[PDB]
């Protein structure tokens, strides 16, 4: 394919651990290791807002555009919510007794999941004053990554350093199933293929491998070996037929999501790659990744 990669916006900062696109404003949310979070207008190149939230790392950061919120999870155990128009803090609660690795936001329901080093995923309901509605117990190490099935968010997958993916149903305490990934350095990330033509999940590991999973057959479709150190993330782009992976090798790679052949290796020049966001509507097929030395927003051709 012709990918026509364009550097939309680049910003140097502290290490970016979390990153997310606003769905209707030309904004990106970055969540930094210094305890700072930033909202950047990547079209105008103007900073919209920045907030010193704590002194510890803030690893997880999403928009909740329907409530004009940002939600952020930090190593100080806390989930914090801010109205991005005013800066007003909405809530600030101890979510786990250990580090918060990942936050996912339910698309239609007032539900947030947090993944943590306390070995659990916790479900929060903001229409019940952020009440803990369920604790998903069973994982054996740090829950690195939580992701709702975007085709059915009554279900979510949890990526863990116990080297399993677990797929759960909201309201059920036992997992639907457990993927034994054979990624012995653990699972850093898990994502779903969002289109209906394949029942696919993807994982990334410290073992330098990416693995494609069929949740119908519970088998490994493919192994993608194209990084020379820790693979931080691997995600299916929501429109283009590509996978984007990012590594502590400082590189972003674009794979053919059909043939699993490398389309492009991006040496972005900000050292270790930590996180990825894709624009939810696929506006300019926008992608962005967080790095040791800042973030970059990229637009992809049709």
């Amino acid at each position: 394919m012709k990918l026509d990669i364009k550097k939309t916006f680049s910003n140097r900062s502290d290490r970016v651990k979390g990153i997310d696109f606003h769905p209707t404003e030309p904004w990106v949310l970055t969540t930094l290791y210094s305890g700072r979070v930033e909202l950047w207008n990547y079209e105008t190149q103007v900073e919209v807002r920045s907030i010193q939230v704590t002194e510890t790392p803030v690893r997880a950061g999403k928009f909740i555009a329907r409530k004009n919120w940002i939600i952020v999870g930090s190593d100080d155990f806390r989930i914090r919510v801010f109205n991005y128009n005013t800066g007003e803090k909405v809530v600030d609660f101890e979510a786990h007794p250990d580090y918060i690795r990942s936050i996912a936001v339910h698309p239609t329901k007032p539900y947030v999941l947090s993944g943590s080093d306390d070995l659990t995923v916790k479900l929060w309901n903001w229409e019940n004053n952020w009440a803990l509605e369920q604790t998903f117990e069973g994982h054996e190490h740090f829950v690195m990554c939580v992701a709702f099935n975007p085709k059915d968010p009554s279900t979510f997958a949890s990526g863990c350093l116990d080297r399993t993916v677990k797929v759960w149903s909201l309201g059920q305490s036992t997992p639907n199933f457990t993927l034994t990934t054979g990624q012995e350095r653990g699972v850093n990330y898990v994502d779903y293929y969002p289109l209906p033509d394949k029942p696919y999940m993807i994982t990334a590991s410290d073992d330098l491998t990416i693995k494609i999973w069929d949740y119908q057959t519970k088998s490994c479709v493919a192994t993608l070996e194209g990084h020379m150190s820790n693979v931080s993330f691997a995600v299916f782009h929501p429109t283009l037929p590509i996978i984007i992976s990012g590594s502590e090798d400082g590189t972003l790679k674009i794979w053919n999501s059909s043939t699993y052949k490398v389309e492009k290796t991006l040496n972005v020049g900000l050292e270790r790659s930590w996180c990825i966001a894709t624009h939810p509507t696929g506006r300019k097929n926008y992608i962005a990744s967080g790095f040791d030395n800042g973030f970059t927003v990229l637009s992809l051709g049709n």
Binding site: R15, Y33, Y99, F142, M144, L161, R272
Partner: peptide, 6 residues
């Protein structure tokens, strides 16, 4: 030492 500190 915290595992996955960075």
């Amino acid at each position: 030492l915290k595992i996955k500190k960075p």
